[PDB]
């Protein structure tokens, strides 16, 4: 562009939006589980992933992923969620913090304990 | 090509439902299909209902 053309109309910068909008620039949020179920991933993976539908404290209604082997969650349980996207799951955009308010750590987990909230034996 | 997209039949006897009530669900097969140009193994499934 000509320097005159730039003086008349300067350069713009990409907005570069966020991909975890339900958190609202918060590291973690608290919510209530309205539904706990399972779902099937995209091509080519195949499993029965465990997800949950959660209503936050600011009114948002999102879907969260429950990692680890086995959970004690059910309807009407309060949990703490954080960012993180599961790729092959379409619509899942957050992760459930294990070891939080009403979710317990993975039973018999001796490696990477702090990521699943298990106390040192 | 081959069998039935859906078959519905009636089985009549003494003691039928008490032994066929556990076949209701999904049945998975892993094998080389007949409609296969190459030699690939394929996984497929069928659904069974007993009432």
């Amino acid at each position: 562009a000509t320097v005159n053309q730039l003086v008349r109309k300067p350069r713009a910068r990409k907005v570069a939006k966020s991909n975890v909008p339900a958190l609202e620039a918060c590291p973690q949020k608290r919510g209530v589980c309205t539904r706990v179920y399972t779902t099937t991933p995209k091509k080519p993976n195949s499993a029965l992933r465990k997800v949950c539908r959660v209503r936050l404290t600011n009114g948002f209604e999102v879907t969260s992923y429950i990692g680890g082997e086995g959970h004690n969650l059910q309807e009407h349980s309060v949990i703490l969620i954080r960012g993180g996207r599961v790729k092959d799951l379409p619509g899942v955009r957050y992760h459930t913090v294990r070891g939080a308010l009403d979710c317990s750590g993975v039973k018999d987990r001796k490696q990477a304990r702090s990521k699943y909230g298990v106390k040192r034996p | 090509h081959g069998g039935y997209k859906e078959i519905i039949a009636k089985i009549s006897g003494d003691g039928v439902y008490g032994r066929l009530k556990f076949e209701s669900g999904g049945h998975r097969v892993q094998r080389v299909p007949a409609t296969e140009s190459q030699g690939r193994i394929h996984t497929s499934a069928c659904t069974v209902a007993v009432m």
Binding site: - | R19, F22, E23, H27, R28, V29, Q30, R31, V32, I41
Partner: protein, 48 residues
């Protein structure tokens, strides 16, 4: 049903067997009896 290995497995009771050729010939009485057994001990256990 795995034809490459010739193995039939039942996930409800976790029972694997290597007699698929007999099973595909209407000899599945060797598959349904183990289930019924496990289906009956629960019925007695579900009396509370």
């Amino acid at each position: 049903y795995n034809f490459p290995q010739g193995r039939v497995t039942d996930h409800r009771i976790n029972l694997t067997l290597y007699r698929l050729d007999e099973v595909m010939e209407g000899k599945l009485d060797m598959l349904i009896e183990p289930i019924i057994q496990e289906h009956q001990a629960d019925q007695l256990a579900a009396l509370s």
